Amino acid sequence: FDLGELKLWSFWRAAIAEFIATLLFLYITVATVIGHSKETVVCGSVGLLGIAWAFGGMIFVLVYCTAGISGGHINPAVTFGLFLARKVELLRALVYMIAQCLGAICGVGLVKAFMKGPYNQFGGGANSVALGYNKGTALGAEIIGTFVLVYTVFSATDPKRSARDSHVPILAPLPIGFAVFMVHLATIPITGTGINPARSFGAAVIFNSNKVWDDQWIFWVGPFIGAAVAAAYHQYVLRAA
């Protein structure tokens, strides 16, 4: 009636979907990053533009694949924002965040398994503050970048349709992927662009440097604030539902 449990099984398949999607996200995107960076021929890579596309377009693809199954978060800040507005229950939120973090670690681990030399040599796909910017600028860049993203996800929620056996709204994947694309064009030079604690974490775990670990709180704090401000903006100021 729910007698089948149903549901349950749907909940755990959602967690798996978010685990595998975040793995694919990090594999494809960090492989792109390392592939660009190891390139010897000047203008012989996909460029920073290709990297930006890999991040936005994989979000587009992955949210498309997972919207109806898990709600398609692929991103602890997105889950956190939706949690705050009560579109995600606390247990699912935490399970999604763990799934995403674990998926991200595996995805980056795979890139490193495939091209260990250039992976270590060229920065591990990790986020950190680039030379010429301070921590406050980096944090502000991450807050506002995640705000664009989570503002987009809220505007992209279906108020009638939900992920399977849940009340997690279905998301329109394209505007969300484009938001990620745009924020990369702006934020790559500053931090590489985080806007996704799982993506930053997965890379910090595998690359394992003190420099990167020191900057890592930015990539949790910035996005969670950006996400919280988007949630409040959408739900309370625009009201908006």
Residues near a second copy (CB under 8 A):
13, 16-17, 20, 24, 27-29, 31-32, 35, 38-39, 42-54, 57-58, 60-61, 64-66, 69, 110, 113-115, 117-118, 132-133, 137, 140-141, 144, 147-148, 151-152, 155-156, 173, 175, 178-179, 181-183, 185-190, 233, 237-240
SS (H, E, C) 145-198: HHHHHHHHHHHCEEEEEECCCCCCEEECHHHHHHHHHHHHHHHHHHHCCCCCHH
Closest approach of a second copy to the CB of residue 241, in Å: 11
Give the helix ranges, DSSP H, for the chain: 9-37, 47-70, 76-84, 90-114, 116-121, 135-155, 173-191, 197-207, 210-215, 218-232
d(Cα 57, Cα 181) in Å, to the nearest integer?
7
Nearer to a second copy, 47 or 167 (CB): 47
- Taking the complex as a whole, how short is the minimal distance between the CB of residue 130 and a second copy, in angstroms? 10
- CA 124/CA 211 separation, integer angstroms: 12
Identify which of residues 142 and 201 has a Cβ nearer to a second copy in the complex: 142
Q: How far is the CB of 34 from a second copy (least distance, A)?
A: 9
Cα–Cα distance for residue pair 189/208, rounded to 1 Å: 21
**Closer of 109 and 213 to a second copy (Cβ):** 109
Q: For residues 137 and 209, which CB has a smaller minimum distance to a second copy in the complex? A: 137
Nearer to a second copy, 101 or 144 (CB): 144
Nearest approach, Cβ of residue 192 and a second copy (Å): 12
CB of 12 to a second copy, least distance (A): 10
CB 105 within 8 A of CB 201: yes
Angstrom distance (rounded) from CA 32 to CA 56: 13
Reduced to 3 states, what is the DSSP secondary structure of residue 1?
A: coil
We find the least distance from the C-beta atom of residue 127 to a second copy, in angstroms, to be: 15
- Are the beta carbons of 124 and 203 closer than 8 angstroms? yes
Nearer to a second copy, 94 or 182 (CB): 182
Facing residues of 169 across strands? 162
Residue 210 CB, shortest distance to a second copy, in Å, is: 25
Tell me if 149 sits within 8 A of 179, measured CB to CB.
yes
- By beta-carbon proximity to a second copy, the closer residue of 9 and 217 is 9
